[PDB]
Amino acid sequence: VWRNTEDEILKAAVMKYGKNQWSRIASLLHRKSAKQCKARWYEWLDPSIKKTEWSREEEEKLLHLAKLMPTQWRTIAPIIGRTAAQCLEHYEFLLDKAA
Amino acid sequence: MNPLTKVKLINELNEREVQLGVADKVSWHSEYKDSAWIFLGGLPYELTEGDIICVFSQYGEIVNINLVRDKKTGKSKGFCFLCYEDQRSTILAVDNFNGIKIKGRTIRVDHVSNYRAP
Amino acid sequence: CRRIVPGQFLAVDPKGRAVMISAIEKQKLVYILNRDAAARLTISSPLEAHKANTLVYHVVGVDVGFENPMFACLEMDYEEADNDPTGEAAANTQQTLTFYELDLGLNHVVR
Amino acid sequence: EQDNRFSNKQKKLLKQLKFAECLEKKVDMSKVNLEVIKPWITKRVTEILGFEDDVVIEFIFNQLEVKNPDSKMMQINLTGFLNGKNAREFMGELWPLLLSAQENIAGIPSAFLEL
Amino acid sequence: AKHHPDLIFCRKQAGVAIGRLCEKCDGKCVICDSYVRPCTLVRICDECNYGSYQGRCVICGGPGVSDAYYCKECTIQEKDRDGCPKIVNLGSSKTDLFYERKKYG
Amino acid sequence: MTDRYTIHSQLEHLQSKYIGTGHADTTKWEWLVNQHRDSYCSYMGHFDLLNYFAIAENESKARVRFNLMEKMLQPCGPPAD
Amino acid sequence: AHKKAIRRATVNTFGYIAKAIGPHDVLATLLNNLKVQERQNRVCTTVAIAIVAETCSPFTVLPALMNEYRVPELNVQNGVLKSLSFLFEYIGEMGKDYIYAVTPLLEDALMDRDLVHRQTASAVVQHMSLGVYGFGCEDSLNHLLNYVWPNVFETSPHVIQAVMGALEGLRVAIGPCRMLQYCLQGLFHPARKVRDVYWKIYNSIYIGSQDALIAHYPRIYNDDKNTYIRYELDYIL
Amino acid sequence: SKKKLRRMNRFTVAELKQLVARPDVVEMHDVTAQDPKLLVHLKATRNSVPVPRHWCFKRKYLQ
Amino acid sequence: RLPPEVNRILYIRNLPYKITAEEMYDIFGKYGPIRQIRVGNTPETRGTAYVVYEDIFDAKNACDHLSGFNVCNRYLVVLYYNANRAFQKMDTKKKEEQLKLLKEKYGIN
Amino acid sequence: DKLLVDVDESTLSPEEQKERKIMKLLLKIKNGTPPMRKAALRQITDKAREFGAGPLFNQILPLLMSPTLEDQERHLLVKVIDRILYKLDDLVRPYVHKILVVIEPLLIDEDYYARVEGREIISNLAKAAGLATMISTMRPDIDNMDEYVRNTTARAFAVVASALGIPSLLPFLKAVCKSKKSWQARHTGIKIVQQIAILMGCAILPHLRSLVEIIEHGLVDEQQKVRTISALAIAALAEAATPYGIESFDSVLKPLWKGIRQHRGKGLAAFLKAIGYLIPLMDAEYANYYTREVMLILIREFQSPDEEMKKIVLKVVKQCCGTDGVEANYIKTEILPPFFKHFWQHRMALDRRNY
RNA sequence: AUGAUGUCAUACUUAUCCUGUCCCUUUUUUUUCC
Ligand SMILES: [Zn+2]
Ligand SMILES: [Zn+2]
Ligand SMILES: [Zn+2]
């Protein structure tokens, strides 16, 4: 997995190099590739991603969408503004709290 | 050293020569190419000739049979000498029958070098 | 000049087959002595006689003819006067002459 | 013998067990006939155990036939086979009988002097 | 060997039998674990010299090929005066690596 | 507990193979008693403290030797209790 | 390499080619290796500097070691300390010329820069004492005792047994009087951790040189019931 | 408690400071020693070297 | 013709909670005679069952066949039991009394 | 399986049950990466005393008896038992028999390191739980009816004898090997004696005569088995006491030498091993007569089919016909010809010890 | 102002490893018969 220490070194690298030079950023870290550095930045570390709690507008959206386009989370996600992994876990969450 | 170890050791002899990759001409049996006599031991005391033959005839015709029984009571001592019709059948029998269970008793087979008649 | 390390007493046996070296307390070794083919002195490994809480006053080789060699230790045992809160065992603890005996057939030293 | 990181468990019991009462007067064996005692030992234990244990018998015998036996060590060694308090009672019962037999002039205990 | 705290010496009385080294172990001291200025020879307990135990590595235990010595530092502090310095226990590491291998290949 | 009695183990070993060592529970009496006994065994080894003493009193070296070895069984009083 | 034969032979040939060429260039490429990170290579370069120094006399390579101890890394400071440990054990009796050059480095390391700094300066002191035994270089060793001694209350296995080795080297080179003057006050301390340590040290002073101590013990008065004073030692004659 | 009997043995610091020949030497905890008279006498011997300051400190040494 | 780890006692998990004992019995007697059945009660053991058959072959071919059975929206996870420890003493008194019965009855000694 | 259902801890009001679950980090030891193994090992070996023996061995021992356990898992589990056995010193006093029932099979095992480790932990067990515990614990197994446990108990006995000292165990031996109801106990005691000789080796010399007198009542017994095992134990002892102790064996040269002539079969092999090992230990005016008598039997057994027979006469020939008290021409004439005719075969090469 | 607890990886220490070797595991209804 990723540790606070890698994460902060990534944040600093990206903030110096920019978001298209993943190969030198991957050279800066040990046990990390450019594929993985990129995935981490665009999944969790990007300050555009929001980690708050769901407005119930957002949750009525999530439910309506996840019924209209079933199993299509990378397509659902941008229509509501969080990553596909967050949408998906929180959706299962509402489902089991409702079950 | 009880006879079950003497079984285990003959079987070890076989599978060891297998691991070593010995040719069929320098098998340890080659030292016996002039004797069609095998010794069976560990036999149960109730088996008769009829049984020893019905069992061991699988590998050839049996020319002679010699079940050694205690002279006073006539009951079997529990071992036999057996003369096949071709030495090669003794090869087969020693490899194949050494270590089979007959009625719980696990009998044992091996060639005989310079058999002396009784 | 240590106290449990042999060197203080040194006895020999009259027929000339072994030496015993001994400390003032707790250790005794016994060396065996032989001739070789060339009749030069050759010495074995040590045997042992270690016994705890025993001063030694003197050691000497007892004379016996070609039996197992014997050594004659004076002795004592401070082990109880160490554990007698009054001073009783301080007095009325008395020496004990003891004979140790090699066993060259069996190679150990028995008291 | 070679290790330092383990303690002498005998000495530890030598401190921390509860022993018998007659276990002080040192005892010699020259002064004793045993073949008189032996049946007493046998019946004593065989009752304690409800059955017969030859090995415990011979264990006690062999531990006794020494020149001077250690009553402490003997009570310890019997603590396993018997139930611990049984060992205390049994040894503090035999050992005084030993003193009796030994100050007797034939070497025999006063119990079988009477009986 | 001053490296592995888990091992133990025979520690019983000396003898006259010189001590021997396996080829892995060749050249080092037996306590100080040095590589230099060896001064005196090793003498081993008769028990730890008896039978199959003759001519082995004091340390390794394999086939002894050369005589073991004591460094000058052991000789000066007199750590050569304690009787048989044969390690009488195998350790965790031998059987450990052995099992890791026998699982691997 | 663990460390307590395991170093109690190692020190019992040390002492029993080396009379004279100590541990955290060594009393004044046994300290000074081993210290006296060593002093005597060394007056006897050293051929010249033996002279010094035999000349300071007026005895012979054999008597002085005998007296030391007599004292060596309770050099500092009876035990603590 | 994973094999110790190869590394031993490699270190030896660093020595030989230092004998063919001068020492300087091979020694410079060897301080650079102390800049790596895996320990086995750095411990093997530390033995190679010792060998270069012992073949071509130590006065050639010391100033460069002592200077390399001023660069700000952990691993190179411990590299030069471990290298001195090896070097003093190798040169043996000729330590007596460099002991004074070295000591100001060791006290500087024994006033912490790390646990491992103190552990390795303690090993240096052990081998340096065993080497300079018998030549009257004793005030230096006593001065370093003043810095090694406070590390007696440690708990790391390696730091505590490095300090023990140092104290027994210094026992043979400074003698048991000094060592007992250091052990005395803590044998009967209130606490028990300090009694534990002090009795371990005292046992090791006692076991070796238990005879030299007869002349050294202090005078302990006699109380009511027992007589603790040794009077034979006050007979005048 | 036999512990509290040993505690009943424990002199007061002024008790100690009185009996011994040099009182400066006596510190606080010296009372708690199983041999306080010895301890103080050994602290008053010439040329000996006092225990390192940091045995009580809760932080370790050059940490 | 059996491998020894075969047992007449098997361990079953992935059961429906609260499952009807009668179902249990016939579901399992789709093979033969059931000597005994125990269902766990404490929540930790809730949902699993030890089943003691009276026939070696019954138990084994049950472990052959049913392992991989799906009832109640879950596959029945089974295994052989390793009855490798005892859990209380074997009661010498009644033991020797019933063997005393044996001997008194059949006149051995 | 208890690890699978998860519920809050304080629900498990037994703190015995809480520590039970947390001690099933045994899984993290058994399976795990080396980091997990290292950390869990340190944890268990630190928390051992608090955990207590009961919980520990109750979880650990079924593991060691599991039928599918492979090699490395067992090595790790026994290393665990080793460390906690060293931390808990006395507290194992109730579990010694369980530990033995599990560890004993390591003593007869093909992996040399398994045997050495089992020997080592049984030694530490004997030291931790003192003599009386071991004696009382393993007595009822001398008389057991499974040869398996009789054998492994014998070997374990020899280990605790090495660890604790013969002089402390010797009365118990005398007892068992002179028990008169059961010959199983006599066999097993004589066998313990054999194993002591095999293991302690040189250190039996001070007690040699005591052991030989323990054992010499067997060379005359009527039950053939215990006779054979007494002869084997004599040969073991002689080998452990090369040249020494001959005056201790003195009592026993007679039962052998007459058993030799009027014996045939397997006892012949055993008594031959014994006399062969004594022949070196003997002074020339004895060895010459004994040798020149024995070589007569030997020449006859060169044609023996038995594998133990052949191996025994190989050893014997090496000792007998290889002293300073024989003459070259006799060998050259009478031993070499049938030696090379009957021993240099392919079967011998194929065997690993006969080789 | 340095507390213990830590399923936190990092950093370090041990000229530790990475070649060392299987040989005393043979254990059961004695049984190779002129
Ligand atoms: Zn080696
Ligand atoms: Zn050394
Ligand atoms: Zn040894």
Swiss-Prot record, chain A:
Which compartments does it reside in?
A: Nucleus; Nucleus speckle; Cytoplasm
Tissue note: Ubiquitously expressed in both fetal and adult tissues.
Q: What is this protein identified as?
A: Cell division cycle 5-like protein
Q: What post-translational modification does the entry describe?
A: Phosphorylated on serine and threonine residues. Has no effect on subcellular location nor on homodimerization. Phosphorylated in vitro by CDK2. Phosphorylation enhances interaction with PPP1R8.
The similarity comment for this entry is: Belongs to the CEF1 family.
Q: What does this protein do?
A: DNA-binding protein involved in cell cycle control. May act as a transcription activator. Plays a role in pre-mRNA splicing as core component of precatalytic, catalytic and postcatalytic spliceosomal complexes. Component of the PRP19-CDC5L complex that forms an integral part of the spliceosome and is required for activating pre-mRNA splicing. The PRP19-CDC5L complex may also play a role in the response to DNA damage (DDR). As a component of the minor spliceosome, involved in the splicing of U12-type introns in pre-mRNAs.
Per the record, the gene is: CDC5L
Recorded disease is: A chromosomal aberration involving CDC5L is found in multicystic renal dysplasia. Translocation t(6;19)(p21;q13.1) with USF2.
**Domain of life from the UniProt record:** Eukaryota
Part of the intact protein present: 10 to 108 of 802
Q: Which residues form the HTH myb-type domain?
A: 1-47, 48-99
Give the recorded effect for residue 22 to G: Abolishes DNA-binding
Residues annotated as DNA-binding region? 22-45, 73-95
UniProtKB/Swiss-Prot annotation, chain C:
Task: Tell me the residues on which Phosphoserine occurs.
Answer: 45
Q: Where in the cell is it found?
A: Nucleus
Lineage, top-rank taxon, reads Eukaryota
* Region annotation Interaction with SF3B1 and SF3B5: where it falls in the sequence: 82-111
**Which family is it part of?**
Belongs to the RSE1 family.
Name the job this protein performs: Component of the 17S U2 SnRNP complex of the spliceosome, a large ribonucleoprotein complex that removes introns from transcribed pre-mRNAs. The 17S U2 SnRNP complex (1) directly participates in early spliceosome assembly and (2) mediates recognition of the intron branch site during pre-mRNA splicing by promoting the selection of the pre-mRNA branch-site adenosine, the nucleophile for the first step of splicing.
Name of the molecule in the record = Splicing factor 3B subunit 3
> In which organism is this protein found?
Homo sapiens
Swiss-Prot record, chain D:
Q: Posttranslational modification, per the record?
A: Phosphorylated on multiple serine and threonine residues by DYRK3 during the G2-to-M transition, after the nuclear-envelope breakdown. Phosphorylation by DYRK3 promotes disassembly of nuclear speckles.
Effect of changing residue 12 to A: reported as: Strongly reduces DNA and RNA-binding
Describe which stretch of the whole protein the shown chain covers, with first residue, last residue and complete length: 12 to 126 of 904
Organism listed in the record: Homo sapiens
**Assembly notes:** Identified in the spliceosome C complex. Found in a pre-mRNA splicing complex with SFRS4, SFRS5, SNRP70, SNRPA1, SRRM1 and SRRM2. Found in a pre-mRNA exonic splicing enhancer (ESE) complex with SNRP70, SNRPA1, SRRM1 and TRA2B/SFRS10. Component of the minor spliceosome, which splices U12-type introns. Found in a mRNA splicing-dependent exon junction complex (EJC) with DEK, PRPF8, NCBP1, RBM8A, RNPS1, SRRM1 and ALYREF/THOC4. Interacts with DDX39B, CPSF1, RBM8A, RNPS1, and ALYREF/THOC4. Seems to be a compound of RNA export complexes that are released from speckles in a ATP-dependent manner.
- Chain positions covered by the region annotation Necessary for DNA and RNA-binding: 1-115
Family, similarity comment:
Belongs to the splicing factor SR family.
Can you name this protein? Answer: Serine/arginine repetitive matrix protein 1
Which residue pairs form cystines in this protein?
none
Q: Where is each PWI domain found?
A: 16-115
Region (Necessary for mRNA 3'-end cleavage and cytoplasmic accumulation), start-end ranges: 1-115
Where found in the cell?
Nucleus matrix; Nucleus speckle
Swiss-Prot record, chain G:
UniProt subcellular location: Nucleus; Nucleus speckle
Start and end residues of each stretch annotated as Interaction with PHF5A: 89-90
HEAT repeats: which residues? 55-93, 96-134
- What modifications follow translation? Phosphorylated. Phosphorylation occurs concomitantly with the splicing catalytic steps. Citrullinated by PADI4.
Q: What are the boundaries of the region Interaction with SF3B3 and SF3B5? A: 181-237
User: Which residues carry the site feature described as Interaction with SF3B3?
Assistant: 138
Annotated site, Interaction with RNA, chain positions:
74
Q: What is known about what this protein does?
A: Component of the 17S U2 SnRNP complex of the spliceosome, a large ribonucleoprotein complex that removes introns from transcribed pre-mRNAs. The 17S U2 SnRNP complex (1) directly participates in early spliceosome assembly and (2) mediates recognition of the intron branch site during pre-mRNA splicing by promoting the selection of the pre-mRNA branch-site adenosine, the nucleophile for the first step of splicing.
Give the record's subunit note: Component of the 17S U2 SnRNP complex, a ribonucleoprotein complex that contains small nuclear RNA (snRNA) U2 and a number of specific proteins. Part of the SF3B subcomplex of the 17S U2 SnRNP complex. SF3B associates with the splicing subcomplex SF3A and a 12S RNA unit to form the U2 small nuclear ribonucleoproteins complex (U2 snRNP). Within the SF3B complex, interacts directly (via HEAT domain) with SF3B3, SF3B5, SF3B6 and (via HEAT domain) with PHF5A. The SF3B subcomplex interacts with U2AF2. Identified in the spliceosome C complex.
Q: State the name under which the record lists this protein.
A: Splicing factor 3B subunit 1
State the organism's lineage. Answer: Eukaryota, Metazoa, Chordata, Craniata, Vertebrata
Gene responsible for this protein: SF3B1
Indicate the span of the full protein covered. 1068 to 1304 of 1304
